PDB file of C-alpha atoms in Angstrom:
ATOM      1  CA  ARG A   1    -124.726 -30.662 -54.827  1.00 55.96           C
ATOM      2  CA  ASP A   2    -125.201 -33.973 -56.541  1.00 51.21           C
ATOM      3  CA  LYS A   3    -123.366 -33.789 -59.827  1.00 54.57           C
ATOM      4  CA  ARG A   4    -122.563 -36.241 -62.380  1.00 51.11           C
ATOM      5  CA  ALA A   5    -119.239 -37.308 -61.776  1.00 52.87           C
ATOM      6  CA  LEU A   6    -116.999 -38.127 -64.633  1.00 51.58           C
ATOM      7  CA  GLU A   7    -116.578 -42.031 -64.601  1.00 51.60           C
ATOM      8  CA  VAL A   8    -113.390 -43.102 -65.654  1.00 50.23           C
ATOM      9  CA  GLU A   9    -111.096 -46.067 -65.662  1.00 48.49           C
ATOM     10  CA  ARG A  10    -107.335 -46.869 -65.257  1.00 47.27           C
ATOM     11  CA  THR A  11    -105.513 -50.168 -65.594  1.00 46.13           C
ATOM     12  CA  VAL A  12    -102.466 -50.786 -63.751  1.00 49.84           C
ATOM     13  CA  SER A  13     -99.770 -53.222 -64.047  1.00 48.26           C
ATOM     14  CA  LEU A  14     -97.914 -53.885 -60.568  1.00 45.97           C
ATOM     15  CA  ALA A  15     -94.973 -55.013 -62.716  1.00 44.60           C
ATOM     16  CA  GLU A  16     -94.859 -51.602 -63.923  1.00 46.30           C
ATOM     17  CA  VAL A  17     -94.632 -50.206 -60.292  1.00 45.57           C
ATOM     18  CA  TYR A  18     -92.016 -52.504 -58.998  1.00 45.26           C
ATOM     19  CA  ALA A  19     -89.889 -52.467 -62.238  1.00 46.64           C
ATOM     20  CA  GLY A  20     -90.136 -48.611 -61.960  1.00 46.66           C
ATOM     21  CA  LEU A  21     -89.203 -47.793 -58.531  1.00 47.27           C
ATOM     22  CA  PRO A  22     -86.258 -45.206 -58.228  1.00 44.52           C
ATOM     23  CA  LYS A  23     -83.096 -47.067 -57.726  1.00 43.01           C
ATOM     24  CA  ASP A  24     -83.134 -46.312 -53.850  1.00 42.38           C
ATOM     25  CA  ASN A  25     -86.490 -47.964 -53.712  1.00 40.93           C
ATOM     26  CA  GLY A  26     -85.051 -51.236 -55.016  1.00 39.69           C
ATOM     27  CA  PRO A  27     -86.796 -51.790 -58.445  1.00 41.99           C
ATOM     28  CA  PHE A  28     -87.328 -55.306 -59.313  1.00 38.68           C
ATOM     29  CA  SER A  29     -89.117 -57.464 -61.673  1.00 38.50           C
ATOM     30  CA  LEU A  30     -91.982 -59.013 -60.239  1.00 40.23           C
ATOM     31  CA  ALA A  31     -92.402 -62.083 -61.598  1.00 42.53           C
ATOM     32  CA  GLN A  32     -88.822 -63.009 -60.694  1.00 45.44           C
ATOM     33  CA  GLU A  33     -89.197 -61.971 -57.149  1.00 46.29           C
ATOM     34  CA  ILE A  34     -91.941 -63.908 -56.609  1.00 43.97           C
ATOM     35  CA  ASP A  35     -90.470 -67.377 -57.639  1.00 41.51           C
ATOM     36  CA  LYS A  36     -87.504 -66.404 -55.316  1.00 38.25           C
ATOM     37  CA  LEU A  37     -89.721 -65.706 -52.412  1.00 37.57           C
ATOM     38  CA  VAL A  38     -91.741 -68.897 -53.023  1.00 36.39           C
ATOM     39  CA  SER A  39     -88.903 -71.031 -53.339  1.00 34.24           C
ATOM     40  CA  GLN A  40     -87.337 -69.609 -50.331  1.00 36.58           C
ATOM     41  CA  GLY A  41     -89.009 -69.906 -47.021  1.00 37.69           C
ATOM     42  CA  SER A  42     -89.162 -65.941 -46.588  1.00 38.08           C
ATOM     43  CA  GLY A  43     -87.685 -62.711 -47.967  1.00 42.08           C
ATOM     44  CA  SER A  44     -88.822 -59.473 -49.493  1.00 42.00           C
ATOM     45  CA  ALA A  45     -88.273 -57.226 -52.377  1.00 46.37           C
ATOM     46  CA  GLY A  46     -88.561 -53.546 -52.986  1.00 50.09           C
ATOM     47  CA  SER A  47     -89.105 -50.964 -50.158  1.00 48.37           C
ATOM     48  CA  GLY A  48     -91.434 -48.418 -48.445  1.00 47.55           C
TER      49      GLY A  48
ATOM     50  CA  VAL B   1     -65.520 -56.606 -41.505  1.00 44.92           C
ATOM     51  CA  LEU B   2     -68.347 -58.947 -42.078  1.00 47.18           C
ATOM     52  CA  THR B   3     -71.201 -56.805 -41.869  1.00 45.01           C
ATOM     53  CA  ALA B   4     -69.583 -54.584 -44.150  1.00 43.39           C
ATOM     54  CA  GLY B   5     -69.956 -57.324 -46.910  1.00 40.86           C
ATOM     55  CA  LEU B   6     -73.535 -57.418 -46.790  1.00 38.51           C
ATOM     56  CA  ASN B   7     -76.202 -56.660 -49.504  1.00 38.23           C
ATOM     57  CA  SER B   8     -78.168 -53.647 -48.352  1.00 35.99           C
ATOM     58  CA  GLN B   9     -81.233 -56.205 -48.169  1.00 35.34           C
ATOM     59  CA  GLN B  10     -78.932 -58.490 -45.955  1.00 35.49           C
ATOM     60  CA  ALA B  11     -77.907 -55.583 -44.103  1.00 36.98           C
ATOM     61  CA  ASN B  12     -81.539 -54.617 -43.151  1.00 39.22           C
ATOM     62  CA  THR B  13     -82.087 -58.289 -42.137  1.00 40.88           C
ATOM     63  CA  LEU B  14     -79.050 -58.079 -40.010  1.00 40.76           C
ATOM     64  CA  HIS B  15     -80.112 -55.115 -38.218  1.00 40.21           C
ATOM     65  CA  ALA B  16     -83.737 -56.263 -37.670  1.00 39.50           C
ATOM     66  CA  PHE B  17     -82.226 -59.288 -35.915  1.00 37.23           C
ATOM     67  CA  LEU B  18     -79.664 -57.654 -33.770  1.00 35.42           C
ATOM     68  CA  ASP B  19     -82.270 -55.085 -32.487  1.00 35.29           C
ATOM     69  CA  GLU B  20     -84.550 -57.439 -31.698  1.00 36.65           C
ATOM     70  CA  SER B  21     -82.161 -59.637 -29.694  1.00 36.70           C
ATOM     71  CA  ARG B  22     -80.510 -56.550 -27.867  1.00 36.59           C
ATOM     72  CA  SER B  23     -83.574 -55.544 -26.710  1.00 35.86           C
ATOM     73  CA  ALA B  24     -84.389 -58.790 -25.104  1.00 37.25           C
ATOM     74  CA  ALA B  25     -81.011 -58.848 -23.550  1.00 42.11           C
ATOM     75  CA  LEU B  26     -80.942 -55.200 -22.339  1.00 40.47           C
ATOM     76  CA  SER B  27     -84.440 -55.257 -20.914  1.00 44.18           C
ATOM     77  CA  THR B  28     -83.671 -58.418 -18.902  1.00 42.87           C
ATOM     78  CA  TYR B  29     -80.425 -56.888 -17.652  1.00 44.20           C
ATOM     79  CA  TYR B  30     -81.998 -53.583 -16.760  1.00 43.11           C
ATOM     80  CA  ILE B  31     -85.032 -55.224 -14.857  1.00 41.96           C
ATOM     81  CA  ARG B  32     -82.658 -57.278 -12.854  1.00 42.07           C
ATOM     82  CA  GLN B  33     -79.807 -54.949 -12.190  1.00 43.97           C
ATOM     83  CA  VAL B  34     -80.611 -51.322 -12.850  1.00 44.29           C
ATOM     84  CA  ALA B  35     -84.291 -50.846 -12.224  1.00 45.16           C
ATOM     85  CA  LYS B  36     -85.135 -49.053  -9.083  1.00 44.84           C
ATOM     86  CA  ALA B  37     -87.385 -50.785  -6.401  1.00 45.11           C
ATOM     87  CA  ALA B  38     -89.948 -47.894  -6.471  1.00 47.05           C
ATOM     88  CA  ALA B  39     -90.752 -48.646 -10.066  1.00 47.10           C
ATOM     89  CA  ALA B  40     -92.354 -52.197  -9.713  1.00 48.89           C
ATOM     90  CA  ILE B  41     -91.015 -53.607 -12.620  1.00 52.05           C
ATOM     91  CA  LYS B  42     -91.424 -57.177 -12.844  1.00 54.72           C
ATOM     92  CA  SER B  43     -91.408 -57.864 -16.351  1.00 55.58           C
ATOM     93  CA  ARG B  44     -90.531 -56.628 -19.607  1.00 54.07           C
ATOM     94  CA  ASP B  45     -94.177 -55.203 -20.053  1.00 53.07           C
ATOM     95  CA  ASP B  46     -93.796 -53.199 -16.828  1.00 55.15           C
ATOM     96  CA  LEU B  47     -90.771 -51.786 -18.227  1.00 55.41           C
ATOM     97  CA  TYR B  48     -92.762 -50.572 -21.268  1.00 55.20           C
TER      98      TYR B  48
ATOM     99  CA  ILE C   1    -120.784 -12.946 -80.924  1.00 57.23           C
ATOM    100  CA  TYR C   2    -124.180 -12.008 -80.697  1.00 54.68           C
ATOM    101  CA  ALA C   3    -126.549 -14.125 -78.399  1.00 52.58           C
ATOM    102  CA  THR C   4    -129.513 -15.662 -79.502  1.00 54.77           C
ATOM    103  CA  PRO C   5    -132.569 -13.598 -78.434  1.00 57.95           C
ATOM    104  CA  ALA C   6    -134.367 -14.767 -75.550  1.00 60.65           C
ATOM    105  CA  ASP C   7    -137.592 -16.366 -76.427  1.00 59.72           C
ATOM    106  CA  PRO C   8    -140.096 -13.393 -75.442  1.00 60.97           C
ATOM    107  CA  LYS C   9    -142.934 -15.725 -74.374  1.00 63.61           C
ATOM    108  CA  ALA C  10    -140.762 -17.229 -71.738  1.00 61.60           C
ATOM    109  CA  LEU C  11    -139.720 -13.765 -70.859  1.00 59.81           C
ATOM    110  CA  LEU C  12    -143.471 -13.205 -70.169  1.00 63.94           C
ATOM    111  CA  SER C  13    -144.087 -16.221 -68.157  1.00 64.32           C
ATOM    112  CA  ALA C  14    -140.953 -15.202 -65.847  1.00 67.19           C
ATOM    113  CA  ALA C  15    -142.408 -11.668 -65.617  1.00 66.93           C
ATOM    114  CA  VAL C  16    -145.486 -12.821 -64.745  1.00 67.05           C
ATOM    115  CA  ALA C  17    -144.450 -15.319 -62.340  1.00 65.73           C
ATOM    116  CA  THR C  18    -142.808 -12.448 -60.412  1.00 68.29           C
ATOM    117  CA  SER C  19    -145.317  -9.970 -60.690  1.00 64.43           C
ATOM    118  CA  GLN C  20    -147.795 -12.451 -59.208  1.00 63.43           C
ATOM    119  CA  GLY C  21    -146.000 -12.520 -55.962  1.00 60.74           C
ATOM    120  CA  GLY C  22    -144.349 -15.255 -54.111  1.00 60.74           C
ATOM    121  CA  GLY C  23    -141.019 -13.868 -55.005  1.00 63.74           C
ATOM    122  CA  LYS C  24    -138.957 -16.747 -53.854  1.00 64.63           C
ATOM    123  CA  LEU C  25    -138.925 -18.733 -56.871  1.00 67.63           C
ATOM    124  CA  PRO C  26    -135.351 -19.819 -57.236  1.00 66.87           C
ATOM    125  CA  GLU C  27    -133.609 -21.264 -60.192  1.00 66.31           C
ATOM    126  CA  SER C  28    -133.742 -24.844 -59.999  1.00 66.09           C
ATOM    127  CA  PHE C  29    -130.897 -27.092 -59.994  1.00 66.95           C
ATOM    128  CA  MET C  30    -129.713 -28.460 -63.534  1.00 67.40           C
ATOM    129  CA  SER C  31    -131.133 -31.959 -62.349  1.00 68.46           C
ATOM    130  CA  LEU C  32    -130.028 -35.231 -63.289  1.00 66.86           C
ATOM    131  CA  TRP C  33    -133.464 -36.487 -62.680  1.00 68.54           C
ATOM    132  CA  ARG C  34    -136.292 -36.770 -65.287  1.00 71.28           C
ATOM    133  CA  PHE C  35    -139.819 -35.566 -64.588  1.00 70.98           C
ATOM    134  CA  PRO C  36    -141.498 -38.724 -63.433  1.00 71.29           C
ATOM    135  CA  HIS C  37    -138.966 -39.360 -60.805  1.00 70.76           C
ATOM    136  CA  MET C  38    -139.148 -35.754 -59.855  1.00 71.43           C
ATOM    137  CA  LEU C  39    -142.553 -35.852 -59.704  1.00 69.31           C
ATOM    138  CA  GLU C  40    -142.731 -38.727 -57.265  1.00 66.77           C
ATOM    139  CA  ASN C  41    -140.444 -36.716 -55.062  1.00 68.46           C
ATOM    140  CA  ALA C  42    -142.247 -33.776 -55.229  1.00 68.33           C
ATOM    141  CA  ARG C  43    -145.520 -35.540 -54.542  1.00 68.31           C
ATOM    142  CA  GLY C  44    -144.699 -37.307 -51.496  1.00 67.82           C
ATOM    143  CA  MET C  45    -142.812 -33.972 -50.345  1.00 71.37           C
ATOM    144  CA  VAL C  46    -146.074 -32.151 -50.585  1.00 71.60           C
ATOM    145  CA  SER C  47    -148.181 -34.749 -49.023  1.00 67.48           C
ATOM    146  CA  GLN C  48    -146.119 -34.459 -46.037  1.00 66.81           C
ATOM    147  CA  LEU C  49    -146.658 -30.717 -46.116  1.00 67.29           C
TER     148      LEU C  49
END
């Protein structure tokens, strides 16, 4: 059953995911939300 | 009128708050005034 | 369109292996392992036998 599998790679930007969320999921700029969350004692960004 | 003016993120934050606050209050009331003696509920954990 | 003819010398050794008996001489797996490796495994397998 052992077969050589196709060995593949993929590079993922999370900034692309967050900026890419459907409007109802709260898309956001990752670097900017981080600065706000770090400067604030708490918070969140995006959803789900 | 005031909760109606909230950012949806704030609105969700509000609800999280109110819900945690309300169960503490209602759980307490229930145990002292509503619960039947037969259900030996002494604390919020027994209520669970 | 036209298949390359099977090499008759191999057809013969296959025909012989079948006529020699045994019968259950199954198609081997299109193996990823080279001979030296498989040889060591087969050897350990037989020494257990």
